[PDB]
Paper text:
Human αβ T-cells recognize antigen complexes formed from MHC proteins bound to diverse peptides, CD1 proteins bound to diverse lipids, and MR1 presenting small molecules. Although the four types of human CD1 antigen-presenting molecules (CD1a, [name], CD1c, CD1d) are related in structure, [name] has distinct cellular and immunological functions. As compared to other human CD1 proteins, [name] shows particularly strong recycling through the most acidic endosomes, use of a particularly capacious cleft to capture large lipids, and it is uniquely expressed on a subset of activated macrophages in the periphery. After identifying a distinct pattern whereby T-cells respond broadly to phospholipids in preference to sphingolipids, we solve the basis of this response via a ternary crystal structure of a [name]–phosphatidylcholine–TCR complex.
To characterize the extent of antigen and TCR remodeling during BC8B TCR docking, we determined the crystal structures of the [name]-PC complex to 1.7 Å and the unliganded BC8B TCR to 2.0 Å. Similarly, upon BC8B TCR docking, the PC antigen is lifted from the [name] antigen-binding cleft in both the A′ and C′ pockets, allowing for significant TCR contacts with the sn1 acyl tail. The PC head group is lifted upwards by ~6 Å and bent, allowing for favorable contacts as the phosphate moiety is inserted into the BC8B TCR cationic cup. [name] presents several abundant-cellular phospholipids, including PG24, PC, PS, PE, and PI. Comparison of [name]-PG and [name]-PG–PG90 TCR complexes shows that TCR binding resulted in extensive repositioning of the lipid, with the TCR β-chain moving 7 Å toward the PG head group and vice versa, pulling the antigen up slightly from its fully seated position in the cleft.
Numbering used by the authors:
A (entry chain B): 1 to 100
B (entry chain A): 4 to 285
Write the structure that this text describes.
C-alpha cells in the first residue's frame, strides 16, 4: 500500500506533422499509482482549453493510464507539451512534443 | 475472428479519509471501453449502440442496480472495518472481474483485487484466495467476506453464469465495430541521436485496427534484427500507434527501408525508404 509509482509520459501526433495542416496531439500517461493526477496539454507554455481524455483504466500490474488529446495545427515555430502533476512529483513534469 | 476476446469491469475506490470515498468504474472489451459508470446517477453509460449485447433492458437494469448497491455498500463496509484492518489513509483499492474466450472455445472467468497497487486477492474455483502480497490482512479479508451470504453466491453467478453469455452476446452484437479493418499510415523521422556518430531512425505506424501489426526495418529483403519495437500506444476512436526504431552508425543509414504489414492491407505491405543528407521528405 505504500510505494507510489511515477507517471511515464509520451507525446505524439495522430498523423505526420505537416505545418498548417490540422492534426491531433496525444499525451499518454501511464505506469502511475495512485490514480489522482492532473494532465494538461500546453501550446507555447499556455494551457489548452478544450482537451479530451479517457476514463480511468489500469494495466495488469495495477498501474493507471490515461489518454489526453486535442486537435492542433502544427507550425514551424509553435511549441506543444504535456504537463503532468502527481503526488510522486514535487513539481509539474513537462514533456515537449517533438516531431523529430 | 479478430478483435477483442474478453470482457471485464474495473473498479477504482479511493479512500481519502474516514468519511470520504469515491469510486470510478467502467466496462471493457480488452482495452476498448464500452461502458462508463456515472456517479451522478448511479447508473451506467452505454458507449456503443450495442453495449447491452443480447441482454434485455430489464436484465441490464437489474445489473446496474446490483452495481449501484455494491459500490455504495463496498465503501460503507471498508470504512466500517478500516480500523480493525489497521488501515491508514489515504488508500486505494482496485478490482477487475470478467471472462474471456480461449482457443478451443472455453470461457474462463476471473476476479482480482488490489490494495496499494499490489495484488490482494483473486477468485479461483469460486473461492477467495488471498495473495501473498496482501499478507495477513488479505487472509483476514477472505475469511470475513465468505461469511457474507449472498455475496459469495452473487459473485459465483455473475462470474460463471452471467459473464459467459454476456460476453458471447456482446462480441456478436458489436461485430461491425469489433471486427472492422482500419488501414495504417506510416512515415519516417529522425530519433534522438544515441550518441557520437550514430543515428536513430523511426518508423511511425498510426491509425490501424485491430491491434496485431508487423513493422520491421529492412535492407532489401534482409530484416534488421536491431529493430526496436515501441509499446503500442492508443489513438482516440479505437486505433493504435507504434514506433519501430533502429540505431545505426552515421554512414550506414543509406539503404534502409521500413516495411509494414497489417490485416487491413490485404497483402499489400507499406514500404518506406530512408534517404540521407536531408532528402527524407519532399
Ligand atoms: C445471449 O447469447 C448467449 C449465446 O448465444 C449463442 O451465441 C450467440 C453468439 C449467437 O450465436 C446465439 O444464436 C447463440 O445461441 C445465450 O447463451 C446460450 O444459450 C443457449 C440456448 O439458446 C445455450 O445452449 C444450451 O446449452 C445447453 C448445454 O449447456 C451446458 O453445456 C455446454 C457444453 O455442451 C456448456 O458450454 C454450458 O455452459 C452448459 O454447461 C443445452 O442443454 C441446451 O440444449 C437444449 O436446447 C437446445 C436448443 O437450444 C435443444 O436443441 C436441446 O435439445 C436442449 O433442449 C442448449 O444447447 C448455451 O449454452 C448458452 N451459452 C452460454 C455460454 O451460456 C444467451 O441465452 C440465455 O442464457 C442461456 C444460458 C439460456 O438460459 C437461454 O435460454 C437464455 O436466453 C443469450 N441471451 C442472454 C439473455 O444471455
Ligand atoms: C473447487 O471447489 C469445489 C467446490 O467447493 C471444492 O470441493 C469442495 O471441497 C471442500 C473442501 O475444500 C468440501 O468441503 C467439505 O465438506 C464436507 C461435507 O461434504 C465437510 O465435512 C468438510 O468440513 C470439514 O472441513 C472444513 C475445511 O475444509 C472445516 O471447516 C469443517 O469444520 C470440517 O472440519 C468440508 O467443509 C466440499 O464438500 C467440496 N464440495 C464439492 C461439491 O466437491 C474443490 O475442493 C475439493 O474437491 C474435492 C471434492 O470433490 C476434494 O477431494 C478436495 O477436498 C478438494 O480440495 C475445489 N477444488 C480444489 C482443487 O480445491
Ligand atoms: C450488461 C453488462 C453485464 C455484465 C456481465 C456481468 C460481468 C460481471 C463479472 C463480475 C462482477 C463482480 C460483481 C461484484 C459485486 C457482486 C456482489 C454484490 O454486488 O452484492 C450486492 C452488494 O452487497 C453489498 O453491499 C456488500 C458490499 C461489500 C463488498 C465486499 C467485497 C467483495 C469482493 C469479492 C471477493 C470474492 C469473494 C469470493 C467470491 C467467490 C449487490 O446488491 P444486490 O444484488 O441487490 O444484493 C445481492 C445480495 N447479496 C449480496 C447478499 C447477494
Ligand atoms: C476528508 O477528506 C475530505 C475530502 O477531501 C477532498 O477530496 C479528496 C479527493 C482530496 O482531493 C482532498 O484533498 C479534497 O480536499 C474532506 O472534505 C474536504 O475538506 C476540505 C478542507 O477542510 C475542503 O477543502 C474540501 O472541500 C472538502 N471536500 C469535499 C467537502 O468534497 C474532509 O474535510 C472535512 O469537510 C470539510 C467540508 C470541512 O467541514 C472540514 O472541516 C472537514 O475536515 C476530510 N475530513 C477529515 C477528517 O480530514
Ligand atoms: C450493464 C452495466 C454495466 C456496468 C459496468 C460499469 C461499471 C461497473 C463496475 C463496478 C463493479 C466492479 C467489480 C470489480 C470486481 C471485483 C471486486 C474487487 C475486490 O476488491 C478487493 O480486493 C477488496 C480489497 C480490500 C482491501 C483490504 C483493506 C480493506 C479492509 C477493510 C475491511 C473490509 C471488510 C469488508 C467485509 C464485508
Ligand atoms: Cl511548450
Ligand atoms: Cl493480477
Ligand atoms: Cl454510484
Ligand atoms: Cl490486519
Ligand atoms: Cl445475481
Ligand atoms: Cl516518410
Ligand atoms: Cl540473431
Ligand atoms: Na471511522
Amino acid at each position: 500500500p505504500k510505494i507510489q509509482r511515477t507517471p511515464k509520459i509520451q507525446v505524439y501526433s495522430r498523423h505526420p506533422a505537416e505545418n498548417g495542416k490540422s492534426n491531433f496531439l496525444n499525451c499518454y500517461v501511464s505506469g502511475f499509482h495512485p490514480s489522482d493526477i492532473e494532465v494538461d496539454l500546453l501550446k507555447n507554455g499556455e494551457r489548452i482549453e478544450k482537451v479530451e481524455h479517457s476514463d480511468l483504466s489500469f494495466s495488469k500490474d495495477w498501474s493507471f493510464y490515461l489518454l489526453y488529446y486535442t486537435e492542433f495545427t502544427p507550425t514551424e515555430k509553435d511549441e506543444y507539451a504535456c504537463r503532468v502533476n502527481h503526488v510522486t512529483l514535487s513539481q509539474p513534469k513537462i514533456v515537449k512534443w517533438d516531431r523529430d | 475472428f479478430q478483435g477483442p476476446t474478453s470482457f471485464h469491469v474495473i473498479q477504482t475506490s479511493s479512500f481519502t479519509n474516514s468519511t470520504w470515498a469515491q469510486t470510478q468504474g467502467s466496462g471493457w472489451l480488452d482495452d476498448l471501453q464500452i461502458h462508463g459508470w456515472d456517479s451522478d446517477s448511479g447508473t451506467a453509460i452505454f458507449l456503443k449502440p450495442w453495449s447491452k449485447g443480447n441482454f434485455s433492458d430489464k436484465e441490464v437494469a437489474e445489473l446496474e442496480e446490483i452495481f449501484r448497491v455494491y459500490i455504495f455498500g463496498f465503501a460503507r463496509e471498508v470504512q466500517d472495518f478500516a480500523g480493525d484492518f489497521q488501515m491508514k489513509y489515504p488508500f486505494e483499492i482496485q478490482g477487475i472481474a470478467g471472462c474471456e474466450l480461449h482457443s478451443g472455445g472455453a470461457i474462463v472467468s476471473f476476479l482480482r483485487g488490489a490494495l496499494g497497487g499490489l495484488d490482494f486477492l483473486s477468485v479461483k474455483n469460486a473461492s477467495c484466495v488471498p495473495s501473498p502480497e496482501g499478507g495477513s490482512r488479505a487472509q483476514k479479508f477472505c475469511a470475513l467476506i465468505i461469511q457474507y451470504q449472498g455475496i459469495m453466491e452473487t459473485v459465483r453467478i455473475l462470474l460463471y453464469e452471467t459473464c459467459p453469455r454476456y460476453l458471447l452476446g456482446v462480441l456478436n452484437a458489436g461485430k461491425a465495430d469489433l471486427q472492422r479493418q482500419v488501414k495504417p499510415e506510416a512515415w519516417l523521422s529522425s530519433g534522438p541521436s544515441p550518441g557520437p556518430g550514430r543515428l536513430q531512425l523511426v518508423c511511425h505506424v498510426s491509425g490501424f485496427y485491430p491491434k496485431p501489426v508487423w513493422v520491421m526495418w529492412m535492407r532489401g529483403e534482409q530484416e534488421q534484427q536491431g529493430t526496436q519495437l515501441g509499446d503500442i500506444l492508443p489513438n482516440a476512436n479505437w486505433t493504435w500507434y507504434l514506433r519501430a526504431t533502429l540505431d545505426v552508425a552515421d554512414g550506414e543509414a543509406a539503404g534502409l527501408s521500413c516495411r509494414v504489414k497489417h490485416s487491413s492491407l490485404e497483402g499489400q505491405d507499406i514500404i518506406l525508404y530512408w534517404r540521407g543528407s536531408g532528402l527524407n521528405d519532399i
